[PDB]
Amino acid sequence: HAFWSTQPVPQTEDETEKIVFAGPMDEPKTVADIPEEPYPIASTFEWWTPNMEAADDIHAIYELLRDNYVEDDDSMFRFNYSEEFLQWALCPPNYIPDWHVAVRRKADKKLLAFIAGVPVTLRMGTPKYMKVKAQERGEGEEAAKYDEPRHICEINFLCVHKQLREKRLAPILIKEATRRVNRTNVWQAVYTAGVLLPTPYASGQYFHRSLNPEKLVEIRFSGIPAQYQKFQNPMAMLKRNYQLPSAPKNSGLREMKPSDVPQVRRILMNYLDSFDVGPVFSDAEISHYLLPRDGVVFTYVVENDKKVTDFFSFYRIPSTVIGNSNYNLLNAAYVHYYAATSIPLHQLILDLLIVAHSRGFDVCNMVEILDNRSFVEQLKFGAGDGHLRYYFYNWAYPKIKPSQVALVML
Numbered sequence: 001h002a003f004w005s006t007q008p009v010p011q012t013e014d015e016t017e018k019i020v021f022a023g024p025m026d027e028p029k030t031v032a033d034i035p036e037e038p039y040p041i042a043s044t045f046e047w048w049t050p051n052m053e054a055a056d057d058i059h060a061i062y063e064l065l066r067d068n069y070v071e072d073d074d075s076m077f078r079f080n081y082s083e084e085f086l087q088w089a090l091c092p093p094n095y096i097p098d099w100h101v102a103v104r105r106k107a108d109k110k111l112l113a114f115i116a117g118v119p120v121t122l123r124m125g126t127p128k129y130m131k132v133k134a135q136e137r138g139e140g141e142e143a144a145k146y147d148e149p150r151h152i153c154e155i156n157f158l159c160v161h162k163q164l165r166e167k168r169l170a171p172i173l174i175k176e177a178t179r180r181v182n183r184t185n186v187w188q189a190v191y192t193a194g195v196l197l198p199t200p201y202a203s204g205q206y207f208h209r210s211l212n213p214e215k216l217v218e219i220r221f222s223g224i225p226a227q228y229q230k231f232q233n234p235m236a237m238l239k240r241n242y243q244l245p246s247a248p249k250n251s252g253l254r255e256m257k258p259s260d261v262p263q264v265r266r267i268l269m270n271y272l273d274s275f276d277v278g279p280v281f282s283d284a285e286i287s288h289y290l291l292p293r294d295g296v297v298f299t300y301v302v303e304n305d306k307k308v309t310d311f312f313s314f315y316r317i318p319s320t321v322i323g324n325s326n327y328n329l330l331n332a333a334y335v336h337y338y339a340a341t342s343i344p345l346h347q348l349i350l351d352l353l354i355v356a357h358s359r360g361f362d363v364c365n366m367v368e369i370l371d372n373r374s375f376v377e378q379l380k381f382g383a384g385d386g387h388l389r390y391y392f393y394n395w396a397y398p399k400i401k402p403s404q405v406a407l408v409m410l
């Protein structure tokens, strides 16, 4: 690892396994110690900070990701994050525009690479159980040192043009992004990836709940499981197995609206503070991340006797179906944040599935963070072949189960 061997991250699993306290990797620094000038690059390339209040700029990023962002190992599906989605994801309250870092070609101003950082406030102190192991050694003082939430950077949408792959461009992007974050006096970041890098503090497998199995089989996202072949019409029985009620079972379920924001913030933060790693949200950020938004984020509440008691949200990311004969797009819903006080979690997520299905989604996707693992079987989710790995930059963190992670990454 010619690049990651130089960075302040735990370098191996044997080393992450032997970590028992949260805290930084690198000795302190100041803004003064960080270069003022952007890092140098090829003569035909320049750095470009896009303006996310301008549809031209958003459009140029959209096209780069649409054609060059994450594909599956078979090159059959590729994320097609929408423009509305990108403006939502990249511009939460207090976002910093200088954290959105691009390289374009001088000659024709063509977008060639991208990486985005947005600020988040994250609890990232010693996990509860490692703290118990610590209170026993009288080391409680060290274990609790970094328990207060920290304002850090969340990195996403790293992307290099297919025609420029393997020219060490991503390390220059990563470094220039680090620089700009450091000049802002931020020293930690959180990020996720489907690939193994040095070194995750958690990993969760992906799970999928089929909503339109016929289409999913047609485009070869899924197949017909062998035991359906004992039927005269396997596809009919597969559809029956995945069939859903026509409308929600929970009366009192309604779309979220702005007046709901403080009660949703209350119940969410009670649920989220249960977990070792989880975000801390103000009313503004709750509003930004949960309030319905057409084609992007969908959020519903259970109102019992005037009070909000439960809620769920999901977000939409279609994927390009790469050269298919009947289909352009896979329409996928992704379980977002949620909270249950009045009903079992699986009864609440069953209404998420019913709503997603009625709004035309083909599949419901999730990672086994939060308590997602606990309803996989009750709700006929299938296990996928990929995992999402959680990483910290410049933060030593003990290994934890994904069910102790509460940060949903877009």
Ligand SMILES: CCCCCCCCCCCCCC(=O)SCCNC(=O)CCNC(=O)[C@H](O)C(C)(C)COP(=O)(O)OP(=O)(O)OC[C@H]1O[C@@H](n2cnc3c(N)ncnc32)[C@H](O)[C@@H]1OP(=O)(O)O
Binding pocket: 001, 002, 003, 004, 005, 068, 069, 070, 071, 153, 155, 156, 157, 158, 159, 160, 161, 164, 165, 166, 167, 168, 169, 170, 171, 174, 177, 178, 181, 182, 186, 187, 188, 189, 191, 192, 193, 194, 195, 197, 393, 394
């Ligand atoms: C304090 C603030 C800190 C801020 C920074 C925090 C850290 C944030 C870090 C980033 C978090 C991003 C989270 C997301 O958004 S994850 C999703 C990333 N996107 C894609 O996979 C889209 C399709 N692929 C591509 O666009 C390119 O292949 C990419 C850009 C991924 C690599 O480009 P390319 O294929 O042309 O290679 P290269 O010659 O330029 O560079 C080779 C080096 O790159 C290392 N590499 C490969 N894949 C990844 C990866 N996914 N995260 C981190 N590093 C990665 C690799 O180990 C090697 O280093 P080493 O093996 O030599 O050591």
